[PDB]
Amino acid sequence: MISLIAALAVDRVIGMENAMPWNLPADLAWFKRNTLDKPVIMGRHTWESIGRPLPGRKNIILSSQPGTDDRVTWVKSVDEAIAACGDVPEIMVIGGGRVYEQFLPKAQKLYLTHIDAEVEGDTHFPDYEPDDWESVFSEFHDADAQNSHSYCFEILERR
Ligand SMILES: NC(=O)c1ccc[n+]([C@@H]2O[C@H](COP(=O)([O-])OP(=O)(O)OC[C@H]3O[C@@H](n4cnc5c(N)ncnc54)[C@H](OP(=O)(O)O)[C@@H]3O)[C@@H](O)[C@H]2O)c1
Ligand SMILES: Nc1nc(=O)c2nc(CNc3ccc(C(=O)N[C@@H](CCC(=O)O)C(=O)O)cc3)cnc2[nH]1
What we know:
This protein has 159 residues and is an alpha/beta fold. The protein has a single domain, classed as Dihydrofolate Reductase, subunit A (3-Layer(aba) Sandwich). It contains 4 helices and 10 strands. An 8-stranded mixed beta sheet has the order 5-4-3-6-1-7-10-9, with helices on both faces. A two-stranded antiparallel ribbon has the order 2-8. The longest helix is centred in the N-terminal third of the chain and has 11 residues, at 25-35. The radius of gyration is 15 Å and the shape is globular. It is classed as oxidoreductase. The entry lists the keywords oxidoreductase, NADP, trimethoprim resistance, methotrexate resistance, one-carbon metabolism.
């Protein structure tokens, strides 16, 4: 099955031209936990912002152009990305906006981090209808000396 993992602020904002104005190490540990040892699919833009291959994961990059890094797998379409994943229990789609939009309709689970932050952004997670999903797990956390804003982890299963 296919799952999407994303961190969203209010208004579903997930990205902007500059780095996000937040520091959430706990959210990053959550991302790592949920993605280790699974293939992760991402768009070229996301790849660039990440900067290097995520360790302990099969990295698949979507791009209309020829790949520029032989350490990861590059594909030219959604179908080819799925196939490059092989026979695995769970495929994780890590963004960005374009990518999420194309995989949402095919996903069975969403791992979302809701951040209590208002930011101007130019990229949004796709709108989803709550009633179409079941919240199977949720856990709120307040900001702390290490995390700049409060946040909530939620796992949704498609009904
Ligand atoms: N807060 C979060 O959870 C989170 C998670 C991920 C990303 N983000 C952010 O979101 C941004 C990136 O989102 P984005 O929408 O701009 O970019 P994106 O989805 O990462 O990448 C878009 C690129 O992927 C390729 N692509 C997408 N669909 C394709 C398809 N069907 N076939 C071939 N290539 C395809 C194209 O690459 P070419 O241009 O090379 O053709 C396209 O320009 C950044 O701000 C980033 O930090 C946030
Ligand atoms: N929950 C969630 N939070 C995010 O920040 C997020 N970011 C992306 C894309 N951007 C990134 C940026 C950096 C790293 C990153 O460096 N991750 C390392 C973490 C090392 C650590 O724990 O700092 C990794 O190994 O996962 C991952 C995705 C996709 N889904 C998300 N999902």
